[PDB]
Design a protein around this ligand. Sequence first.
Ligand SMILES: Nc1ncnc2c1ncn2[C@@H]1O[C@H](COP(=O)(O)OP(=O)(O)O)[C@@H](O)[C@H]1O
Ligand SMILES: Nc1ncnc2c1ncn2[C@@H]1O[C@H](COP(=O)(O)OP(=O)(O)O)[C@@H](O)[C@H]1O
Lengths: 601, 588
Amino acid sequence: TLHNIITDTENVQGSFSKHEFQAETKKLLDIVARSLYSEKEVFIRELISNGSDALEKLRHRMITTAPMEIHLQTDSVKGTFTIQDTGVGMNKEDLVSNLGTIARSGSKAFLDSSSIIGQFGVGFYSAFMVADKVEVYSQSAEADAPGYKWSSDGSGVFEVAEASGVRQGTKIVLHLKDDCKEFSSEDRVKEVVTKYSNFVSFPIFLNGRRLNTLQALWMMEPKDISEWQHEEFYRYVAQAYDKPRYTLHYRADAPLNIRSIFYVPEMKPSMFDVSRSVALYSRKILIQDILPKWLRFLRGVVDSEDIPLNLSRELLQESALIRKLRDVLQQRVIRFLLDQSKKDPEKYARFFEDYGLFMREGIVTTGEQSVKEDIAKLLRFESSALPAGQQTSLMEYSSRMKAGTRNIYYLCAPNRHLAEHSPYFEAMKQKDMEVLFCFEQFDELTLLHLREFDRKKLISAETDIVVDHYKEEKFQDSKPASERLSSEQAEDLLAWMRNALVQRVTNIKVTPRLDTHPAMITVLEMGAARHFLRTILQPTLEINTGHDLIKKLHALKDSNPELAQLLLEQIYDNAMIAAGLNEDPRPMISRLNQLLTRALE
Amino acid sequence: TLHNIITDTENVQGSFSKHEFQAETKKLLDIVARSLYSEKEVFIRELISNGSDALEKLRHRMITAGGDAPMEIHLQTDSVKGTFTIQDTGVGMNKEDLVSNLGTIARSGSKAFLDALQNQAEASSSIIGQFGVGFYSAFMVADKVEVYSQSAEAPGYKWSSDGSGVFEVAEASGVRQGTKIVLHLKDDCKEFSSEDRVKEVVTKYSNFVSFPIFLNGRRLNTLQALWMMEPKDISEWQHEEFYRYVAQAYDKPRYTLHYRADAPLNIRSIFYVPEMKPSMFDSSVALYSRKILIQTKATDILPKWLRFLRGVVDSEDIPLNLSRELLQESALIRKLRDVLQQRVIRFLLDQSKKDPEKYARFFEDYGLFMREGIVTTGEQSVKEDIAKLLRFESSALPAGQQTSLMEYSSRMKAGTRNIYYLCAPNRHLAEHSPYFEAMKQKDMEVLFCFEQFDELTLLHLREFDRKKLISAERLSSEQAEDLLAWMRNALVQRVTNIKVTPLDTHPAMITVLEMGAARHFLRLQPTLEINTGHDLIKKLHALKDSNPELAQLLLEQIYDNAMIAAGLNEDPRPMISRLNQLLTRALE
Ligand SMILES: Nc1ncnc2c1ncn2[C@@H]1O[C@H](COP(=O)(O)OP(=O)(O)O)[C@@H](O)[C@H]1O
Ligand SMILES: Nc1ncnc2c1ncn2[C@@H]1O[C@H](COP(=O)(O)OP(=O)(O)O)[C@@H](O)[C@H]1O
């Protein structure tokens, strides 16, 4: 039933020769020269980092004064790019060993702490991506020491000749290939520097003008950072013009090394961009997610020494590692935002109004219940048990629940007045249960997807009203029996209503649970029905036979049957609208206007 | 104010010593084994590609040599010994080729094979190898690697290594024709001795390899690379299944474009538009090369506004990064993106002609991508290309039915200059804008733009057909004034202007002077026009002194009813309790 050819059959005959791996060096030069990096411009990053390492080796050994800097020059007329550092330089033996041997890194034999970038022994060859000729002039300290010129066309061979007039350090001239002349442009070179080499530890000069390198804030001690320094750094990393309303400066060492800053912009998010975020670093140079999708409103920077880098310094090398980093950051950001709620609830209300949509998206799109509930801790509602305007949370609702209660009741309505006076809340007031009031458009969807919180099932007031019909409906009316239609009158009214609304409602019943309102529409899965109307069901019309409008309808059906029918139709429509289950309300206006005149004689 | 230290001061004195570039072979094995790829699992992709190439070389030998011999790649896991084994029945390797091909970094037997083929030999486009390093990915995951190989000529051989500097070679019996590679997995890579883990990697990268792949005796890669076949020989059901696979979807493609071409690059591609519609509560076009996955999410081959497309792009000659997971920057790849943009745009315009019904549903669903594209590009010729897909409503024909900018440019007074538009919430608010009647005197036809972001789409557009887009932004004589003057006093906050106009069935309506101030009343300056013949307004005139409580309930309702008729209030829940009062008081 199976097809296999792999069998343990092989056996060694006789002896074995030992061999050493070799290398096809001409082809290796070519691989590094056109196949290693996806973007040609990174030769600038590679040569600058070598210059920084040379300056580090000099700074380290001179403890044990001279200037320590990196100079760039563009000559568009001669088509050349030049970088010179004032670092340790190289002697002749160093030039042929380090530049001559691919994968040889002097900067790795240097130990035996943390400023060095070099390791792979290949970065220098990236110049041959953009140059058909490379000259190096280098001068060691002290040491012997003559000056040397190293020269190569990049494919095969190089030459080393003694030289005079070589300044302490190293100068590299690239005679640019004809299709790489952009790198003889000052603006072009400047933009590559600030992209990749913007936090280098030594001054960089481009054509005699010093460049505005920055401090790597994320690596520094958090209360050595003023608010003003965060405003400026935020504007740089977010390329923004405003300022951050929150700043989270997050360092960790276990389980992962993490050095990170996150900002929430003062600006409200663009709605065009929400439907249309953080830079990743190591050793202060860039890597080409890190955050769950719902936290993409965050700006800032993340740096982690546990992210291994591929040879090219643009791929990150362990995806499960990245899910772990993502999950650590997500929990830390949730903890931060909860803390902001405690510190300053009014400012958090503003933040929740501007960014809450991201919390809702996060809850709806996660599959992990514990993650859903963690994000849900950020949500804010009002409550029937609190004064109007006062914001509360799911956890505060949980803590007020009596020892016996098993469910969290909520009511979705456009504003505080409507929830407080909803027919659905009037029905719930008969019970002894707090009711969360939720005013935002996608609140109900969110709670439906959340489903439970702290092992307590979420139940909307509308749903709960229907489930009571199938329990011991032990509810008493708000007006005494004198003030309601008699049973004979109700049943006569209901039989008339069923005939007049025959192809619209599944059933029509009297309810003891309304006071202000004449009627309500009920649907077991009310929240799902509201959402499904996102461009016919089994709705029940429940009537308050103590309401003056219902009592009048019962009279109109015999005193003016046609006026009663227009009125019945409008009561149904009003209840549908109150239920949030109404289609386009415009065609109702004619009947209402026709009803209004007829009612007003 | 300058400070530059770069000066022409060096002069060569002495002679040249000429040297050859070399390589530090041990550290290079470490790099090419561990620091190349973004995932350890790629070693399976690499060894399967090598096996495929071995099989392709054997098939090519048999055109002239005509040997036989099943052509298969077999994988075997062993979770007790912690090993992963791959065996192919291809050309194998004699002792010379083992030492040369395995023993030398960057040495590629398959590249030399390719370089010696006739131009149009079928194997020229199927051989994956190139860089000479892929095999070393085994040492990412393996403490020890053993290769048993038998060539198709004349003795079997065993190549062995721990990855550090050196390897051994010995004669071996009894090796089957071809090559068997045994990986002794590192402890922290034991997962690749799990059958289910290996299956995941095979399907991820190697699902379309041209030769049957078996795992522990059972066949895997059952999918065929539709994008390589003749567009005619593919039926609609095959596209539906391939779409569902490649997009990880459960619906159907509403549109299918199967595009093949040969310059600027060899391209074999299928693009699909889903039938279902995106929501904020939530793949991409994959890039392939020679039937191997390069990127599940192809980055730079399509403009970002075409990211709603799903499907596959395969190129035999696209310049690949050493990792085989990225493209090198390339004028050819920039030119391909421009080519694909034009091709897709043309396919969509054709669909609009073949089926305006279908295309209208499509624009409703995906027009945000067309608008985003016109906004975010910086080339005017492209903006007018994407704009050919835009649809709007127009004054010149009724609701629901749509027209293109080319259709508008068609019907214009002989020698008309500008294209005229008005971005508004809806048709009713547009037909009553103080700025619409003015242009109903000049250039009669004006485009009505109800959609979100229509405004900045046309502003960022700025010029289509080299023509400029530009916006623009009964009852007695005076017993009506008695009622009209009484009205502002009871609505001092909301409306400001309350006129009187001839409406028929409606007592009042709402009009707005600027759709900019009305479009974000919906996230106000309303005018309340009134017909004095309506029986609710002659009624309102009466009760204001009769039943003044009833007369304001009636007033709020006429206002709210008018706001609903104008689409400025679409959720009337706040009125309902009051309306119920009005109704209860009107009925006595
Ligand atoms: N500007 C420089 N000044 C001094 N030494 C340098 C310079 N650039 C390169 N080197 C030496 O040459 C070596 C080879 O560099 P490279 O091939 O780029 O690999 P890596 O940067 O990983 O060391 C470096 O390790 C360093 O020892
Ligand atoms: N399974 C195999 N059967 C026969 N030859 C192989 C096999 N695997 C590798 N080779 C040979 O060894 C060479 C080196 O393989 P590799 O280092 O992966 O580089 P590439 O595939 O880019 O050539 C290949 O070109 C091919 O000649």
